[PDB]
Amino acid sequence: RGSEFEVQLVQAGGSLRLSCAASGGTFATSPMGWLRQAPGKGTEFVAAISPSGGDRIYADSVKGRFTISRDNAGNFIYLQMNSLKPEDTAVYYCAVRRRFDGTSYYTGDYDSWGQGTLVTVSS
Structure with missing residues (x-):
């Protein structure tokens, strides 16, 4: 479903796998x-x-619940969301790191890419 972005309804404690694709690696x-x-x-x-x-880092609020991965051709990254809370309700964006002014945790070094995904978690 969707309106400006894709939509995903999930229930608390559920799981969901977001995926984000490019072309030509x-x-x-x-x-x-x-x-x-x-x-x-x-x-x-x-x-x-x-x-x-192999250098995977996590907001401490998702650490241990989420895991990130990618393919090897340079076309895919996945976000594997487990133990969803209603605190996790947000629009999710995959992003390329295009600048190197801060750490890898710095949202400012990232550019959102493609189309966001609204993940609603119903308590």
């Missing part, structure tokens, strides 16, 4: 991430994965 060289915007809130950082697949 667009982000084979780039570090990647997921950002989210909860209503009223600024964009926050969720997870990031390096080109090698």
Whole structure:
């Protein structure tokens, strides 16, 4: 479903797998991430994965519940969301790291890419 973006309804304690695709290995060289915007809130950082697949970092509010991965051709990254809370209700964006002014946790170094996904968690 959707309106300006894709929509996903889930129930608390459920799981969901977001996916984000490019063409021609667009982000084979780039570090990647997921950002989210909860209503009223600024964009926050969720997870990031390096080109090698192996430097994965997590907002402490998703650490241990979410996991990030990618393919090797540079076309896909996934966000595997488990133990969903109603606190996780937000619009989710995959993002390319295009600048290197801060750490890998810095939402400012990321550009959202493609089309967001509203994940509503019903208590």
